[PDB]
């Protein structure tokens, strides 16, 4: 009666803290906001975080419990 | 001893590495039976050990069972090949790790405590030490 | 619930497919949609 | 029964506004505070965390009003002016959590009437 | 207060018949009867069963 599972969706970080990215680079794939859109970062319809401009990726604490990812030129 | 209900009917066997994380110092009683090596203790063995203890004390003093058989185990019948999914739940066990105090007694003199506990130890599949608070 | 096509009242063409529950919306749906032919918003009605 | 703290619940609404609106050096925030008596405007940079232009209902300049709305129009007129002098054009209006209606509206309408582009 | 939603709030005088006391208190249901007390500020009138002053538990 078991024997089922969905295809794995390859979630998680796609670029490293300190790595240079081009505009549109997906930074994080996620369900909901495990990580929040920081500065120069957008949240897509499926919660995907992407760089809005070229620059360097920085994963940062938001405050105590939450986390954000930013892109600094 | 059986859980009134369980979230999952089937459960990994697990492992028994390391010293018991809790219940290593005798807490409610004067004397305790301490597991020296690890083992699964079945509910049938806990009962056999309890009745042996309690009978010798002659409904005197108190007996705390400090282990509970939370974990189900399954078996396949004889004449059944491998596969076709996990077997039916057969029994209930408490994985006892080394250092875990399994039984505690109070309200009897040392001599009677120490005898009731050796009588219990002979029903358990694990090497035991008697320890006092 | 059914697939629906909205026809442009001016353009004539129907380049908008939608869906509706036809029990709850038995009438023909009317939406204002951009008509690419006319390059402006026009009333579109279910066929 | 407990009286509601009007400013506490106001400050809650202000947070909801400041969620979308924040001053920048190129384009600062025109924030309004409204009391039972008098009104106050500050043009702020949240990036630097510094108030540029500012104006109250109790500055030595313009101390003659008929109604609190007229009073609040004088403030807009003055904060617009004081901002233009400092050399800042495009702001974003921060309702401060107040309904964009009576006074705060009249402060904006007025500021907007002078050289401030929102 | 919204308009054209609630009925009239119009003031009206209540008077107990027995003790013959009078007091103003706005209410619905006019009845259209003149009053003696403060007739200049004319209000309707309502004849009433024993009030607090009359009722024996109170007095």
């Amino acid at each position: 009666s078991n024997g089922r599972d969905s295809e794995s969706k390859r979630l998680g970080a796609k670029r490293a803290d300190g790595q240079f990215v081009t505009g549109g680079s997906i930074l994080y794939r996620q369900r909901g906001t495990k990580i929040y859109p920081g500065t120069n970062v957008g949240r897509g319809g499926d919660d995907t975080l992407f760089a809005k401009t070229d620059g360097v990726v920085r994963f940062e604490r938001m405050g105590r419990d939450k986390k954000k990812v930013s892109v600094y030129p | 001893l059986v859980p009134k209900r369980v979230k999952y009917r089937r459960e990994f066997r697990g492992n028994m590495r390391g010293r018991a994380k809790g219940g290593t110092e005798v807490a409610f009683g004067e004397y305790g039976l301490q597991a020296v090596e690890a083992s699964w203790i079945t509910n049938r063995q806990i009962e056999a050990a309890r009745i042996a203890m309690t009978r010798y004390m002659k409904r005197g003093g108190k007996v705390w069972i400090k282990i509970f058989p939370h974990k189900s185990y399954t078996s396949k019948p004889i004449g059944v090949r491998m596969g076709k999914g996990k077997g039916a739940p057969e029994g209930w066990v408490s994985p006892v790790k080394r250092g875990k105090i399994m039984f505690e007694i109070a309200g009897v003199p040392e001599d009677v405590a120490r005898e009731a506990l050796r009588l219990a130890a002979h029903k358990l599949p694990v090497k035991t030490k008697i320890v006092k608070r | 619930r059914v697939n629906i096509t909205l026809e442009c009242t001016e353009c004539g063409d129907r380049n908008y497919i939608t869906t509706k529950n036809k029990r709850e919306n038995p009438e023909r749906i009317e939406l204002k949609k951009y008509c690419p032919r006319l390059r402006r918003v026009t009333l579109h009605r279910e066929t | 029964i407990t009286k509601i703290d009007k400013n506490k619940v106001r400050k809650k609404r202000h947070a909801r506004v400041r969620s979308k609106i924040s001053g920048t050096e190129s384009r600062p925030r025109l924030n309004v505070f409204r009391s039972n008596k008098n009104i106050y405007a500050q043009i702020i940079d949240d990036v630097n965390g510094v108030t540029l232009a500012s104006a109250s209902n109790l500055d030595k300049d313009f101390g003659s009003a008929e109604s609190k709305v007229d009073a609040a129009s004088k403030v807009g007129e003055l904060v617009a002016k004081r901002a233009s002098e400092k050399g800042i054009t495009s702001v974003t209006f921060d309702r401060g959590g107040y309904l964009y209606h009576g006074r705060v509206k009249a402060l904006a309408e007025a500021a907007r009437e002078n050289g401030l582009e929102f | 207060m919204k308009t054209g939603i609630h009925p009239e709030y119009r003031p009206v005088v209540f008077v107990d018949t027995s003790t013959d006391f009078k007091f103003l208190s706005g209410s619905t249901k006019s009845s259209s009867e003149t009053i003696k007390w403060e007739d200049g500020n004319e209000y309707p009138l309502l004849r009433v069963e024993i009030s607090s002053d009359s009722h024996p538990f109170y007095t």
Binding site: - | - | - | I1 | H6, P7, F23, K29, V48, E49, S52, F57
Partner: protein
């Protein structure tokens, strides 16, 4: 206006002098009176509610708000939404008017009364006057109505203790 005046003339000091309050601000006042009907039968027939609203309106001189159920209960045969009972909140002058008509004209139309039932304070400072029937209120006329429903009258005070509340309701005239 007959009762509020009185509350501002010769209750405030009298009541401040009884408890010895530091400021007149501490003096208990009545915030709101809230009448609630509780038409549960309405789950069967909606027209029964229409009457229960119209009659309640006349009592308060202020159209009520038809309260809608919160959770689904099979026992009462009730489901999310569906109107059950009407609320109406009296504040200011139009409230004191009611309180007056409740303590002056309305209550001595019942068969009997003990008084300010000590058992009927919430323990915070607010009083709930349990009204048996609706023919107690003179703006009702039972020869123009079908069913009695009943009523529930909640009096919310600024008072901190039932003791402080009790004195205020007493000196306002409530039995």
């Amino acid at each position: 206006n007959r009762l509020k005046d009185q509350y501002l003339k010769e209750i405030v000091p009298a009541l401040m002098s009884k408890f010895n309050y530091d400021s007149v601000m501490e003096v208990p006042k009545i915030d709101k009176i809230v009448i609630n009907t509780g038409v549960g039968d309405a789950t069967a027939n909606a027209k029964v509610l229409d009457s229960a609203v119209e009659e309640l309106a006349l009592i308060t001189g202020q159209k009520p708000v038809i309260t809608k159920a919160k959770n689904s209960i099979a026992g009462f045969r009730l489901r999310e939404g569906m109107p059950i009972g009407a609320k109406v909140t009296l504040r200011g002058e139009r409230m004191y008017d009611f309180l007056d008509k409740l303590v002056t004209v309305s209550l001595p139309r019942v068969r009997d009364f003990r008084g300010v039932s000590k058992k009927a304070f919430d323990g915070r400072g607010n009083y709930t006057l349990g009204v048996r029937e609706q023919l107690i209120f003179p703006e009702i006329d039972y020869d123009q109505v079908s069913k009695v429903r009943g009523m529930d009258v909640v009096i919310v005070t600024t008072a901190k203790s039932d003791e402080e509340s009790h004195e205020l309701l007493t000196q306002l005239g409530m039995p």
